[PDB]
Amino acid sequence: LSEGEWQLVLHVWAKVEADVAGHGQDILIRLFKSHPETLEKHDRFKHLKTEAEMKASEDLKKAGVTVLTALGAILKKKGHHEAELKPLAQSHATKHKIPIKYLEFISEAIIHVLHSRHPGDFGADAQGAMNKALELFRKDIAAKYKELGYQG
Numbered sequence: 521l522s523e524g525e526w527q528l529v530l531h532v533w534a535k536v537e538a539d540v541a542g543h544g545q546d547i548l549i550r551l552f553k554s555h556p557e558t559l560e561k562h563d564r565f566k567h568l569k570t571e572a573e574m575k576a577s578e579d580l581k582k583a584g585v586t587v588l589t590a591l592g593a594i595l596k597k598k599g600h601h602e603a604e605l606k607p608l609a610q611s612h613a614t615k616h617k618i619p620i621k622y623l624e625f626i627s628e629a630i631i632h633v634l635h636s637r638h639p640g641d642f643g644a645d646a647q648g649a650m651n652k653a654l655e656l657f658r659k660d661i662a663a664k665y666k667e668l669g670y671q672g
């Protein structure tokens with residue numbers, strides 16, 4: 521990414537940072553409604569059925585913050601994220617077993633929610649820059665997954 525692309529990424533991300541939990545809820549609900557098989561990975565809250573139930577769930581709201589806190593720290597490294605990716609790849613490859621396809625689904629949900637909430641900060645410029653940043657994340661985590669023996 522260019523420096524200007526990174527800045528577009530971080531500018532919209534500052535919006536997310538004003539209310540991380542609410543953004544996390546909207547992203548995870550989007551992911552689970554669009555790709556329900558992904559919900560199966562979350563043993564604590566895989567029984568949830570309705571949008572209202574998902575919004576009321578403390579565990580889901582915690583999970584959304586967990587994701588976005590880690591992702592935000594990754595984005596802020598502007599591609600220099602090997603040290604932050606290392607523990608994430610370790611758990612997601614060997615413990616949780618999250619295939620790349622699911623990381624594509626959550627990337628799609630992130631993009632969907634940013635476009636829905638912050639369209640003035642998410643025009644084609646910013647969309648394209650966030651797409652690149654999330655693609656780079658997936659490329660690099662996929663290489664780490666393979667290093668660890670997981671072809672997911």
Ligand code: HEM
Binds near residue numbers: 623
């Ligand atoms: C942007 C992508 C993601 C980030 C940054 C992220 C980050 C995190 C972090 C920081 C944790 C806690 C520490 C750890 O266990 O590594 C975690 C746990 C977990 N993640 Fe992710 N994650 C991502 C995507 C996904 C997806 C798409 C799924 C499932 C479809 C998933 C499933 C899980 C599960 C099952 C746990 C264990 C939670 C528990 O049972 O307490 N993650 N993730």
